[PDB]
């Protein structure tokens, strides 16, 4: 069976439980990084050098890195209805899948930490309201992309590409700062309600 280790808390670690669920595939999960679960420990880091989360051990082979390892579950049990092969569309779905984790995730880095996270390194208030407008600046793009398609992030139609999108905006509507209205990731984010797996491992509350 597929092993999905990590704390279910995580937002890279909800990328990987969407997509189980989004691909119906049975799983069992171990909340590493974790109350008295610890990654830098030698068992954890024999499967991932990193100490990070999220994992999986599917068989014999070992993934880490969650947008690696989300588009591992969907080329290998089927899901081209989600990622799709051809080269333009897999590109379409691509581009926000990698620029979410180049981009959009560093943004938000600071305010995160201190606004939610309540980290005692993070108290500076001028590197907060920095964060901020960073990443405000990196949601209207966001905006941008959705009031041009009225749908979905890539295109007229859900794909791998929503899985970190929403539950990066998810993140952004649940953390405790100053936001313009942006209404076509409101619409979008309605939209989405009607998918199960969207309502259990993204917008659940948990920011």
């Excluded at 670690?13 to 590493?32: I, P, S, Y």
């Excluded at 993070?122 to 749908?151: C, F, P, Y």
Aim: with cysteine; net charge neutral; hydrophobic share 45%.
């Amino acid at each position: 069976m597929l092993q999905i280790l990590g704390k279910p808390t995580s937002i890279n670690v909800r990328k990987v439980l969407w997509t189980c669920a989004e691909l119906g595939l049975a799983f069992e999960r171990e909340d590493w990084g974790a109350g008295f679960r610890p990654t830098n420990v030698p068992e954890f880091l024999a499967l991932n050098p990193n100490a990070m989360v999220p994992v999986i051990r599917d068989g014999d082979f070992v993934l880490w890195e969650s947008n690696s390892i989300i588009r591992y579950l969907a080329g290998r049990y089927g899901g081209e209805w989600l990622y799709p092969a051809d080269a333009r569309e897999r590109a379409r779905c691509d581009q926000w899948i990698d620029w979410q984790a180049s981009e959009l995730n560093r943004s938000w880095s600071y305010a995160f930490l201190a606004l939610v996270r309540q980290s005692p390194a993070h108290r500076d208030a001028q590197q907060i309201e920095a964060s901020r407008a960073n990443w405000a600046k990196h949601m209207a793009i966001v905006e941008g992309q959705l009031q041009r398609t009225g749908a979905f992030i890539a295109g007229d139609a859900f794909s791998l590409a929503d899985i970190p999108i929403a539950l990066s905006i998810n993140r952004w509507l649940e953390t405790p700062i100053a936001r313009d209205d942006l209404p076509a990731v409101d619409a979008y984010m309605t939209r989405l309600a009607s998918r199960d797996a969207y309502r259990e491992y993204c917008r659940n509350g948990t920011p």
